[PDB]
Design a protein around this ligand. Structure first.
Ligand SMILES: Cc1cccc(I)c1
Ligand SMILES: [Cl-]
Length: 162
């Protein structure tokens, strides 16, 4: 297992514009297009991202290239963030994947409310961090996804994905 396989499981793959769990226009492997309610705005964002007139549909190769860019952007966001980088650098490789997964889903600033969890993770207090992570809108709105990610933080294994 690696971060790409983990996120492909969590996000799936769709080649036409769809709505995510919050109602936002998305394509590919969880690539957010826009938070605007306008499908025309979403189609414009798609064409800009792919570099051709897509009319709302992409190829598998295009979806995979967008996905590589999005994972790269999540990692770079962690590494540039003064609050996230020291925690990330303290983690083993499996738990680092759980961190990238959260940033991919919620953004560098969407994890801003997890200050107490970050401290517990840096101290390697895994059970306490797991309980704190579950006291969140994230867990209550996407519980199966959150349980898999939390279990990965708690155990440092891939057991939730196997
Ligand atoms: C809990 C969490 C989420 C995103 C990134 C890190 I480092 C830790
Ligand atoms: Cl879920």
């Amino acid at each position: 297992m690696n971060i790409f396989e983990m996120l492909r499981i969590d996000e799936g793959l769709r080649l036409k514009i769809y709505k995510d769990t919050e109602g936002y226009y998305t394509i590919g492997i969880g690539h957010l297009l826009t938070k605007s309610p306008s499908l025309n705005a979403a189609k414009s964002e798609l064409d800009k991202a792919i570099g051709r007139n897509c009319n709302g549909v992409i190829t598998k190769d295009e979806a995979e290239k967008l996905f590589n860019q999005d994972v790269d952007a999540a990692v770079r966001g962690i590494l540039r963030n003064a609050k996230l980088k020291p925690v990330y650098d303290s983690l083993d490789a499996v738990r680092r994947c759980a961190a990238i997964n959260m940033v991919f889903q919620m953004g560098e600033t969407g994890v801003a409310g997890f200050t107490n969890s970050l401290r517990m993770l840096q101290q390697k207090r895994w059970d306490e961090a797991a309980v704190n992570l579950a006291k969140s809108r994230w867990y209550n709105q996407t519980p199966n996804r959150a349980k898999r990610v939390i279990t990965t933080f708690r155990t440092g294994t891939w057991d939730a994905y196997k």
